[PDB]
Amino acid sequence: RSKPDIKMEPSAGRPMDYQVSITVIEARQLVGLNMDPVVCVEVGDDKKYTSMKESTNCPYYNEYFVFDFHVSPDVMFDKIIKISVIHSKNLLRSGTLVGSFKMDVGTVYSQPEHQFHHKWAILSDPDDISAGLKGYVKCDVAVVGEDDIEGNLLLPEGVPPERQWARFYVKIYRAEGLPRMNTDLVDPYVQVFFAGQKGKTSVQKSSYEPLWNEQVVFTDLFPPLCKRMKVQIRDSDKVNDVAIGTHFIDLRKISNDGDKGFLPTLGPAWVNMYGSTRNYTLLDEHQDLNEGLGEGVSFRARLMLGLAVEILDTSNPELTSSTEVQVEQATPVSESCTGRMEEFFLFGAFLEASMIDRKNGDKPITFEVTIGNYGNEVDGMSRPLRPDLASVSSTPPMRPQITDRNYFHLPYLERKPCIYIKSWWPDQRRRLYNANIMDHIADKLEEGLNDVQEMIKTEKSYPERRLRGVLEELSCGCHRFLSLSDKDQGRSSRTRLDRERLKSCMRELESMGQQAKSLRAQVKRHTVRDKLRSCQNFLQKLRFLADEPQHSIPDVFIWMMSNNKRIAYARVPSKDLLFSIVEEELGKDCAKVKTLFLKLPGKRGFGSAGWTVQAKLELYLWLGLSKQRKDFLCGLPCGFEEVKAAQGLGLHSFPPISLVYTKKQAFQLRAHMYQARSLFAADSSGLSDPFARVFFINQSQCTEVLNETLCPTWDQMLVFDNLELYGEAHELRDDPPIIVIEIYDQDSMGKADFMGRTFAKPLVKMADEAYCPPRFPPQLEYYQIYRGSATAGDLLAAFELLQIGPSGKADLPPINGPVDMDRGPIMPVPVGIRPVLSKYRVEVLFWGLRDLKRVNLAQVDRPRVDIECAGKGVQSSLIHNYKKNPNFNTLVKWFEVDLPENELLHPPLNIRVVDCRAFGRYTLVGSHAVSSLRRFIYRPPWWSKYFASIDTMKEQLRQHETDELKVYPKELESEFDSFEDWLHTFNLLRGKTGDDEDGSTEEERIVGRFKGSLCVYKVPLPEDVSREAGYDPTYGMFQGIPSNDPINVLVRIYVVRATDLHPADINGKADPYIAIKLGKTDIRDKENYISKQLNPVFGKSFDIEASFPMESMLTVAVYDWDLVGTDDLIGETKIDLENRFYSKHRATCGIAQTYSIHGYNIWRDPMKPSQILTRLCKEGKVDGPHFGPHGRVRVANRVFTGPSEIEDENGQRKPTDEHVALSALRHWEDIPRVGCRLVPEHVETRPLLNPDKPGIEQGRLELWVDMFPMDMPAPGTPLDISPR
């Protein structure tokens, strides 16, 4: 696989809705006298307080606090939680602070389920090193998108409870390259933030190159729970205090905990921070990028910085007792120790630049390649003289040309402009060289893991030894890094972090080279699927080691301007651009023709401000020293000449300002698009008008618009012709240029609306290659379609890029073009590339549909469902009365349709339901299409036992982490395949698909939910299938299916107890009761609510008739009782008795362990197990039962044995058939054709869900539900499970 995944809108910089929740449970061992504590919780600037507790050292609150944000993930993690015991706070007095505990959101989120539970917050006096410990405050925390103190601390691993105060020195020396503010001078000062404490240097007025040589001194507890420092170059404008740039120092990459690791240190070395545009806009909408809230769009400033964390002894009297952020003159160092100053030379070559927006391509456009302070001559820098060349940094303004209505292209063609920059940077190439080595190893690890996952999920053989070879290559790469990075250990201009961090990666990857060989033995033929997920734990640490805090050279920016106004940008990091003689030290984007996509600056690159590509460039880049420009043209496309400028005429080492091209290979691209599927709904009808517009270099071609479908089959090859590819064959065969496929809805105005985008790489054939298998012809395989943030479709294509031949286009294999003469210029996908189509009969069970939401404050009385698959389709019977009978009057009605032979290439079968209005205007009220037909392909083949079962499920929990009845430790539909044995369930949709800014949510699209079954088989059909359709052609495969007809059904619910219910009251002990909604019937136990109970025991039994299957929709709920207003809601759950009732699993009544009619084991099913087995025999078309003696039975070709006799409550021996009958119920899977499993009498663990707090647990409930139809013999009297 070489197909790219270049997403224009990644997760970085995306803001999401977030919630922080805190319960302040209690406090104990508080140090002091007569304190009356008010616990204060501050997250950011939002501060809340508890209630009043009077004169205690051990208070109890159990109070709740909720805060909500909508910020980017890195913005959240710097925010500080400030739980504090504050003695005697009121509105006029800031109370006397006992102690506090500063600890950020990122440490919460680093916990595996993002929570801390019942843990004691280690409060300490934050403004005194010598003050004692200030007790512990038991609390719990949660961030969502035993009671001993030492066993339950609120700390991560490694942190001692007796934390040591340490001075967190940061040193601010000098800065360079500052932009304009005043009209246009600058007045800088640097402000540092850490754990709410701030410290700023003195302002040096009127200097682009300041030199403070000052430092900011914090005082905080080692190890720091606040995890980043906000270092921010700032301008001291007196009216508007505005920032220039911001870099975050990450504490984990500069440290390793323990004596085996090292204390944190950094620098003194340069730091490259970014922000808004290079010019000073009078109003700057990218001011948030100056604040570091997102990705920086242009380089703002660079700043030498240091870090000198030193641990103090808390009992030392000579130290300063205050923890304030003092301002102190630092100790300056020479700039030679930061790196020997060297000259660097950038090279760039613009080959192609297409896909320019039509709204901006009216005028001649200019590029601008910049690296840091150098290469920005057009903007008029505040640069001094040479610390020289004119620094040609712009392509000439060239008139664009039209590709289509959407996009332009640039007529570079034979002339490719080039840009070369002189720059001066400190030589710190090893920080990016080791990053390149370990990034190459991590890229190989990514490719191996993705190949193993893709090849595992396609079930191609031999996976685990391939994974073992991947980890063997990983071990070889570990040894390669062990040998490579040691070659310049004795460098003199080297910081302490460059020693200790390097030692850390040496130790880690030395261990990793043997952990790979250990997990090589751990990976087997059956454990490969989960050890593959275990393998990327290595990849997490390797990606973490790959990035480094010490910057040397800032990132290379490529810009766009017309009228010298910036419209589009890109930012490639410079670490992949250095040239090195070591292949692992060589950057990934260096000396290679790299595809790169521009995007809009700031917040307007996301969402509805633009979805179109700003530009697509085949940019060549190179970076290195000015003495290393020896062979920097080795990766360029050959067959070219160089045109140079006046400053470097005749010099062999001088780079050209432009190239003129002598080789123009004619290339024809056969773009085979056959199908798209699961697309976005851009039209108001819940469907779209999709067509594929494919871009390749300077031209574009369009397939014809298909109408009113989300799974189009265009079946349309487009032949791009007479295009020009430059260079030789070795730059195209193993790495062709990219293909961008864009999907659009042909709307009512004529102008199309955006639908998505996918990328591709064609299989390349030169004229000397034979068009022979296994390479040619190219097979169809999928391409994931993205519409920016979210996935919005899947496309099927088999692109091949072919040379236009030495004699003509006829040297290519002959095009199997338009045999259908009406197609004309539209031309089909040829045979061999299209799949073989074999006829499959599709059989639909039109069972019914429930749970329609009341759109337009009513319900549709006459719905009818049409199924459409690959053009062909069938329709059900029209509903004559929906509320009386929500079930179609149709048997298994089928249609025969040509389908793809390969099962992975099956199209999504569409299901839609319409209201049958006048004139055949079939207005859609629901539509669901997402299914894979391989699933539907058919080929012929009381307390006394309860507490014992409680001990049993404790054993089941302890074995999972390492009489009687069954206990399921998860939800009942998890064990029993959701009772979807043949009565399948699908979920309908309506409206436009939910874009994050233009559309609704996906829950708002939910309108109905279909019940039915699908059976797919070939029309050349097998022999047992010929028997099955033989008994009834009106049912097909569906023989012996029970009737649809409605019935009154008794609903019998036993509820045992509830556990760990979330209280709404601030005391922490709710007042719950059981509330049951069944169909349209309300039953509440509010008169018998169990007050003041976290784990109440109900023991109530409820019998209530329902109009099944219309009333087969039940919720079992718990309600915190409240007389005033309404009772607070805890949570509900979905039951849906319909899939229980008609299942073969016998969900009507559970079966006990052994047959007994006395005491706590009395057979509660009114129909005895012998009659149960006879019923399952006639319903399962299997002969039986055939009892001999009461201890044995023959059912089909199988024999079951067991006991024979039972005593009643009178103690008299009654021999019945029921014992071996119930034993056969517990061996009912032995039947070779109809065998299955039966539901036993059980108890169940039920998650409760509240839409007030979605996606998280509200408590558990234990219960089990039986039900009985009212034409069978009458149910037994309601049993009682009242507690002891």
Author numbering: 251 to 395, 411 to 448, 464 to 667, 695 to 1248, 1323 to 1343, 1401 to 1722
According to the publication:
Otoferlin is a Ca2+-sensitive multi-C2 domain protein and belongs to the ancient family of ferlins involved in Ca2+-dependent membrane fusion processes. Thought to be a core component of the SV-tethering and SV-fusion machinery, otoferlin is anchored through a single C-terminal transmembrane helix, cycles with SVs, and hence, it is found on both SVs and the plasma membrane of IHCs. Otoferlin comprises at least seven C2 domains (C2A-C2G), of which four (C2C, C2D, C2F, and C2G) are thought to bind Ca2+, involving aspartate residues in their top loops and likely also phospholipids in target membrane. Our structural work used a truncated construct lacking the nonessential N-terminal C2A domain and the C-terminal transmembrane domain of otoferlin (residues 216 to 1931).
(G) C2F-C2B interface areas in the three resolved otoferlin states. An additional layer of complexity arises from the ability of otoferlin to toggle between discrete states in a Ca2+-dependent manner as it engages lipid membranes. Consequently, the selection of the closed state of otoferlin—where C2B, C2F, and C2G are engaged in stable tertiary interfaces—is likely achieved through a membrane binding mechanism from an ensemble of sampled conformations in the lipid-free state.
